[PDB]
Amino acid sequence: PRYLKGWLKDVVQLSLRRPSFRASRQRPIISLNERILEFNKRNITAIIAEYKRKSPSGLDVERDPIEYSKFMERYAVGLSILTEEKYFNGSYETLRKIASSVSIPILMKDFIVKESQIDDAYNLGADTVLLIVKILTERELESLLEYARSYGMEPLIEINDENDLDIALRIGARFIGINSRDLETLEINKENQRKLISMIPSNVVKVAESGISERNEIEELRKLGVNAFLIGSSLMRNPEKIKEFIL
Numbered sequence: 326p327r328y329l330k331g332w333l334k335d336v337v338q339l340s341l342r343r344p345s346f347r348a349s350r351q352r353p354i355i356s357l358n359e360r361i362l363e364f365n366k367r368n369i370t371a372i373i374a375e376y377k378r379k380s381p382s383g384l385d386v387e388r389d390p391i392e393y394s395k396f397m398e399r400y401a402v403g404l405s406i407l408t409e410e411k412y413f414n415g416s417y418e419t420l421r422k423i424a425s426s427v428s429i430p431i432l433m434k435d436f437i438v439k440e441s442q443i444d445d446a447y448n449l450g451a452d453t454v455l456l457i458v459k460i461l462t463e464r465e466l467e468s469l470l471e472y473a474r475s476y477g478m479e480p481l482i483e484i485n486d487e488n489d490l491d492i493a494l495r496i497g498a499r500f501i502g503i504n505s506r507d508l509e510t511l512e513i514n515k516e517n518q519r520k521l522i523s524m525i526p527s528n529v530v531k532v533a534e535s536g537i538s539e540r541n542e543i544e545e546l547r548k549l550g551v552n553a554f555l556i557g558s559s560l561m562r563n564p565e566k567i568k569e570f571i572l
């Protein structure tokens with residue numbers, strides 16, 4: 326991984342020693358980026374609903390993962406499930422139970438730094454994974470991207486700044502997540518996010534991430550060319566909001 330400080334250094338160390346999960350995979354892969362594209366074609370707002378019990382920025386909600394997922398399944402283009410254990414209170418068991426209960430695409434959200442984690446995602450039932458440019462070196466990112474693709478997954482590659490985007494573009498990313506929140510400082514910057522979105526090639530599927538709680542923010546982002554929206558906190562606090570968001 327890259328030189329890291331603070332909580333990011335810690336979570337990455339936890340990931341390096343994350344035990345692998347052995348399981349047989351039942352359902353074939355359902356492409357999330359292709360489903361986003363077809364929702365775009367049919368003019369339906371594409372929301373990736375995220376499930377997370379806790380977050381380092383303060384979230385702490387008790388809500389049944391299965392019921393939440395089955396409800397979101399009626400509206401969402403896909404689901405994002407946190408499997409990071411220490412800061413997000415996620416687990417592989419949760420991803421496994423959800424994957425067996427819904428039939429929409431599932432993105433496994435964690436801090437992926439080694440190939441076994443992608444093996445875990447595949448064996449657990451996930452359809453794709455998140456790769457974060459800011460914690461990986463360019464060689465690592467390229468290997469992991471190639472590795473995810475060998476399972477037929479197109480990973481969501483997350484950028485937070487211009488240097489992240491140069492790397493993402495250089496390694497041939499086709500599915501990019503623009504995170505308005507800096508993982509290191511936990512600071513949100515809507516403006517920097519807008520600038521980055523505007524620099525991205527039109528043929529890349531773009532997913533806006535973090536801090537979205539209002540339908541107008543979605544409408545604005547959509548006019549900037551964003552294809553999908555990853556929403557977690559506002560939906561965990563109020564699942565019903567999904568009905569306002571897809572109008």
Ligand SMILES: O=P(O)(O)OC[C@@H](O)[C@@H](O)c1c[nH]c2ccccc12
Pocket residue numbers: 375434435436455483504534535536537555556557558559
């Ligand atoms: O809850 P929010 O503000 O809607 O944010 C969602 C999500 O995109 C944010 O969870 C996040 C973005 N990238 C990550 C990578 C790891 C863990 C968490 C994240």
